């Protein structure tokens, strides 16, 4: 029906947090935007270490939301222990499920690594802005030479 959606959880939370705080409400707001439109295939990746106690250099708000979304099978923790794999999981999953990635990160390093991921990101990256709690994706994500947001999120127009 609709393409699978993969949300770069950290990119969205930091964005909603004005790039100063990991804002978990940002993730929930992005998730709800897709849910409201009837999406059922939504995966949000976040590194497992975001479950730990906040260091003072890694502030986080509304942390309780992460386990709530995990319990709803929407959020999936990416592994980490005392290194991470976050961006690669995001891109690999979206690519292999022929879905879309929600992030403002363009993953330049991954683009240079595999050409198929370079082209995938060029065609499937959905960028956005937050205005306070308003999640705003572009109406024409690929421009005049592209589909409507509506069709961009669908397997077929």
Nearer to Mg ion, 7 or 153 (CB): 7
Do residues 39 and 5 make contact, with C-beta atoms less than 8 angstroms apart?
Answer: yes
State yes or no: residue 91 binds Mg ion (CB under 5 A): no
Nearer to Mg ion, 112 or 146 (CB): 112
In angstroms, the CA 85 to CA 80 distance is 8
State yes or no: residue 87 binds Mg ion (CB under 5 A): yes
* Helical pair 24-36 and 64-71, crossing angle rounded to 10 deg: 30
Binding positions for Mg(2+): 87
The strand pair at 42-47 and 60-61 is best described as unpaired
Select the span of 25-33, 55-63, 80-88, 136-144 touching Mg ion (CB under 5 A): 80-88
Query: 3-state secondary structure string, 58-92?
Result: CCEECCHHHHHHHHCCCEEEECECCCECHHHHHHH
State yes or no: residue 13 binds Mg ion (CB under 5 A): no
Nearer to Mg ion, 47 or 137 (CB): 47
Q: How far is the CB of 67 from Mg ion (least distance, A)?
A: 20
Positions touching Mg ion (CB under 5 A) are 86-87
């Amino acid at each position: 029906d609709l393409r699978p959606v993969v949300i770069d959880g950290s990119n969205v939370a930091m964005s909603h947090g004005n790039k100063e705080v990991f804002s978990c409400r940002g993730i929930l707001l992005a998730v709800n935007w897709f849910l409201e439109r009837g999406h059922t295939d939504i995966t949000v990746f976040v590194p497992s270490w975001r479950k730990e106690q906040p260091r003072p250099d890694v502030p986080i708000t509304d942390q309780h939301i992460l386990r709530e979304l995990e319990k709803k099978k929407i959020l999936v923790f990416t592994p980490s222990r005392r290194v991470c794999y976050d961006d690669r999981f995001i891109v690999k999953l979206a690519y292999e499920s022929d879905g879309i990635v929600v992030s403002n990160d363009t993953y330049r390093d991954l683009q240079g690594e595999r050409q198929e991921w370079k082209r995938f990101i060029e065609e499937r990256l959905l960028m956005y802005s937050f205005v306070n709690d308003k999640f705003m994706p572009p109406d024409d994500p690929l421009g005049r030479h592209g589909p409507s947001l509506d069709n961009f999120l669908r397997k077929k127009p």
